[PDB]
């Protein structure tokens, strides 16, 4: 309800930069109430790129229809940042709309176990965390980085070239957080290193976008790593 | 860095096994041998780690180091004596001491080394030397063949997270042998061994995925016990079912 925020159905959109919006969707978790999840919408000349679905097919369709209304450019592809419902719940809606989908090979391998629909294409990563470029064709400003196991074994991150923005997804929590949120599938040993690897991959990003709070500064990365140091 | 921060000899000699310094070698097939090295761990005696040696035409291929550099050098010495073909490459099956502790011995000898990209990424944290090359995997677990150059009969499969998030497995094409490494424990096991780095949620599926990937392998080779039948896979998966 913050000024400049736009509503379409159950979804809220905030412009972060001339060509970048955050999408926010909400799901009731019985016992804990409504939980926000954020992803990104990127205008890349005469096409649109999506990072992460909403919780549900219906909510993901609302994202696609808002893009049609407000941006009116075709969605070329989507990248989804791990096999949990907040990031991949809406895969069927992307596929029905004829959007090409990309995830970590590991995300696609885990998807069935995690009750998610696999992406059509698999990203693979060098030992240094950077996507093998042949697996991420025509990704325009999307720079995809695998920081290592943290929130999950499969979690990936995305920088937006020509912006100050990097997307930590569920790996990064906000700079005032008490906790690292859901650690059910987490690597408690490697998490802190993974948070720091994300920071080092995108050294000049000043706006850190994450799944479960409003955009923060780089302080979110060093706070997440400081919290993660305490897990081991 | 390493979880281990004490090399010894095995006691249970066994008839068809060959002692070579502090290591043990067993021929499993005309072109396949098991290498075994031992660490004394207080309260648990001589702890075996097993890997594989494969002869493929005029080349030898190695799966896994020994626990230590000095032990891994003795694997190379044994290969020179018993096979006398050059070691074309080694593949190591995750970033733990038993599987990657001897990387320096391979690199010293000019042997090209391969691991899961994730193993190489985790190596520094795990106190291991990274392999020279990284394997990547398709969404169905099979190695991307462009990343496994001249692997010949070594058929590398990532079964999913289990013993660790980076554990890989290796079928030996043209044989009845599949290597489960530390993912699979034998049908006599009372535990899944070290779960310090394990994925308790996905372990059972990963164990079953290994079995389904190598459906006709009748000899299952694993890190910490003698080769077993396919029962080792199902018994492991059923123990892993109790973690979730
Ligand atoms: C807000 C904390 C949170 C997370 C998280 O920390 O990322 C997830 S997730 N992506 O499923 O693990 C959930 C859904 C169960 N919740 C409630
Ligand atoms: C014999 C059980 C075992 C395992 C295992 O279960 O694989 C490992 S490992 N590869 O480091 O996790 C060790 C060394 C700590 N030990 C003693
Ligand atoms: Zn998650
Ligand atoms: Zn999340
Ligand atoms: Zn899970
Ligand atoms: Zn291990
Ligand atoms: Zn082991
Ligand atoms: Zn570890």
3D architecture notes:
Two copies of one chain form a homodimer. By secondary structure, the first copy, chain A, is an alpha/beta fold. Chain A has one domain: Metallo-beta-lactamase, Chain A. Chain A contains six helices and twelve strands. Chain A has helices at 57-70, 85-88, 91-96, 105-110, 191-201, 219-229, and strands spanning 6-8, 11-17, 20-29, 33-44, 47-51, 75-79, 100-104, 121-123, 142-145, 157-160, 165-169, 207-210. In chain A, the strands form two sheets. An eight-stranded mixed sheet of chain A has the order 1-2-3-4-5-6-7-8. In chain A, strands 9-10-11-12 form a four-stranded mixed sheet, with no helix packed on it. In chain A, strand 10 and strand 11 form a beta hairpin. The longest helix of chain A is centred in the first third of the chain and has 14 residues, at 57-70. Chain A is globular, with a radius of gyration of 16 Å. Bound molecules: 2,5-diethyl-1-methyl-4-sulfamoyl-pyrrole-3-carboxylic acid (2 copies) and zinc ion (6 copies). The site of one zinc ion has 5 residues of chain A, from loops. Chain A: Monomer. Chain A: One of its GO terms (biological process) is antibiotic catabolic process. Chain A: It is found in: Periplasm. Chain A: Residues 36-212 form the Metallo-beta-lactamase domain.
